[PDB]
């Protein structure tokens, strides 16, 4: 089936690194755009970027470059979300959404990642 | 020319109208458009009063 | 007087693209719309 | 960047070359290629592609 | 970027074009507009793309338009599944953002 699944509720601290895997399957991978996209708790969606596992290839948003880190593994077919330092404000759900080149716009959504990250523990 | 429209542009008072006067007016690109198009045809046509 | 406004174009006829390079209200449209054939314009 | 399965069909060309090109030309019309030099009148016309 | 009605109210049974106001290079440059239905509590599904393709599973009743610099998007029969958010996304060439998403329109049922 044609699915991307995430990773559970998290509680954590700035600074720290979170993993998430995104497993994607029922398409050919490294020939659709796949991209995580974020969304403040109650706000819009914002995107954060869209890569090609072909060649890595990520276009990152101004209102977002330097803050977070993105990947794939083509060798298990599944998308990276990483945090070199996370932030308190930083609570909010993160989408993995595969998109296609042309018309650009995602044709089937991941479940999203709720995950909570503050000061406090 | 290699498919960049030319305009040109130098207005003269002239008193005489019935013989076109001599001299020599050189004029100047006062715009260089680069329409992209073929030109095969034109014509003029003004307004009515 | 005034030599008014100026209509130019190949065939106006959608073979090729258009021109036009009509004068008026200070502003000079270098369009390349294909405008009305009409041999009564303003 | 243009990876649409089953094919982007919103990029053209000209298949039918009608003519030698002009360097830095642009063309955009859209007229059935005769090939048996019949009145096509649309697309009715045989060979007209 | 993309403008939208922060609220839109609908009773059932009613045709309420979801008003997507853009600038002049996200929608009226020609550009396609692409909808999600972002029901709440979940992630939003695709309900819209193209301006006039309905993907599988979205029914009929939903439709999408555009209007010059802006969109719509019609949807007939207001029911309770109905209650859902929608945002309005295009792509923009000048901010070299390859994704553009809307300000978002919430949509109740009287
Ligand atoms: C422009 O039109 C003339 C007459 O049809 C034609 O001979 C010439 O090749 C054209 N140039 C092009 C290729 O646009």
Same mark, same amino acid.
């Given at each position: 089936?044609?699915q991307?699944?995430?990773?559970?509720?998290?509680?954590?601290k700035?600074?720290?690194?979170?993993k998430?895997?995104?497993?994607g399957?029922?398409?050919?991978?490294?020939?659709?755009?796949?991209?995580?996209?974020?969304?403040?708790?109650?706000?819009?969606?914002?995107?954060?970027?869209?890569?090609?596992?072909?060649?890595?290839?990520?276009?990152?948003?101004?209102?977002?470059?330097?803050?977070?880190?993105?990947?794939?593994?083509?060798?298990?077919?599944?998308?990276?979300?990483?945090?070199?330092?996370?932030?308190?404000?930083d609570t909010?759900?993160?989408?993995?959404?595969? #998109?296609?080149?042309?018309?650009?716009?995602?044709?089937?959504?991941?479940?999203?990642?709720?995950?909570?990250?503050?000061?406090?523990? | 020319?290699?498919?960049?429209?030319?305009?040109?542009?130098?207005?003269t008072?002239?008193?005489?109208?019935?013989?076109?006067?001599?001299?020599?007016?050189?004029?100047?690109?006062?715009?260089?458009?680069?329409?992209?198009?073929?030109?095969?045809?034109?014509?003029?046509?003004?307004?009515?009063? | 007087?005034?030599?008014?406004?100026?209509?130019?174009?190949?065939?106006?006829?959608?073979?090729?693209?258009?021109?036009?390079?009509?004068?008026?209200?200070?502003?000079?449209?270098?369009?390349?719309?294909?405008?009305?054939?009409?041999?009564?314009?303003? | 960047?243009?990876?649409?399965?089953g094919?982007?069909?919103?990029?053209?060309?000209?298949?039918?070359?009608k003519?030698?090109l002009?360097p830095?030309?642009?063309?955009?019309?859209?007229?059935?290629?005769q090939?048996?030099?019949?009145?096509?009148?649309?697309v009715?016309?045989?060979?007209?592609? | 970027?993309?403008?939208?009605?922060?609220?839109?109210?609908?009773?059932?049974?009613?045709?309420?074009?979801?008003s997507?106001?853009?600038?002049?290079?996200?929608?009226?440059?020609?550009?396609?507009?692409?909808?999600?239905?972002?029901?709440? #509590?979940?992630?939003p599904?695709?309900?819209?793309?193209?301006?006039?393709?309905?993907?599988?599973?979205?029914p009929?009743?939903?439709?999408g338009?555009?209007?010059?610099?802006?969109?719509?998007?019609?949807?007939?029969?207001?029911?309770?599944?109905?209650?859902?958010?929608?945002y309005?996304?295009?792509?923009d060439?000048?901010?070299?953002?390859?994704?553009?998403?809307?300000?978002?329109?919430?949509?109740?049922?009287?």
């Amino acid at each position: 089936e044609v699915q991307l699944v995430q990773s559970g509720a998290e509680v954590k601290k700035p600074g720290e690194s979170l993993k998430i895997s995104c497993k994607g399957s029922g398409y050919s991978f490294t020939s659709y755009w796949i991209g995580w996209v974020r969304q403040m708790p109650g706000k819009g969606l914002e995107w954060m970027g869209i890569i090609y596992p072909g060649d890595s290839d990520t276009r990152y948003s101004p209102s977002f470059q330097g803050q977070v880190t993105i990947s794939a593994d083509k060798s298990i077919s599944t998308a990276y979300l990483q945090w070199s330092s996370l932030k308190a404000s930083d609570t909010a759900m993160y989408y993995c959404a595969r #998109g296609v080149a042309v018309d650009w716009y995602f044709d089937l959504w991941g479940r999203g990642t709720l995950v909570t990250v503050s000061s406090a523990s | 020319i290699d498919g960049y429209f030319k305009i040109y542009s130098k207005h003269t008072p002239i008193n005489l109208v019935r013989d076109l006067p001599q001299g020599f007016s050189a004029l100047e690109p006062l715009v260089d458009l680069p329409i992209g198009i073929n030109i095969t045809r034109f014509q003029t046509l003004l307004a009515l009063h | 007087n005034i030599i008014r406004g100026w209509i130019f174009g190949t065939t106006l006829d959608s073979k090729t693209q258009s021109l036009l390079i009509v004068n008026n209200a200070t502003n000079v449209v270098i369009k390349v719309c294909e405008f009305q054939f009409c041999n009564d314009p303003f | 960047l243009d990876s649409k399965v089953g094919g982007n069909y919103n990029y053209l060309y000209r298949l039918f070359r009608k003519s030698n090109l002009k360097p830095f030309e642009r063309d955009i019309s859209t007229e059935i290629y005769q090939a048996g030099s019949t009145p096509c009148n649309g697309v009715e016309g045989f060979n007209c592609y | 970027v993309l403008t939208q009605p922060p609220s839109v109210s609908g009773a059932p049974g009613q045709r309420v074009t979801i008003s997507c106001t853009g600038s002049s290079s996200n929608i009226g440059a020609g550009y396609d507009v692409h909808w999600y239905q972002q029901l709440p #509590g979940t992630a939003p599904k695709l309900l819209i793309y193209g301006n006039s393709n309905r993907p599988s599973g979205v029914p009929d009743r939903f439709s999408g338009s555009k209007s010059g610099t802006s969109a719509s998007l019609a949807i007939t029969g207001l029911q309770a599944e109905d209650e859902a958010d929608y945002y309005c996304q295009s792509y923009d060439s000048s901010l070299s953002a390859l994704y553009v998403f809307g300000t978002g329109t919430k949509v109740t049922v009287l």
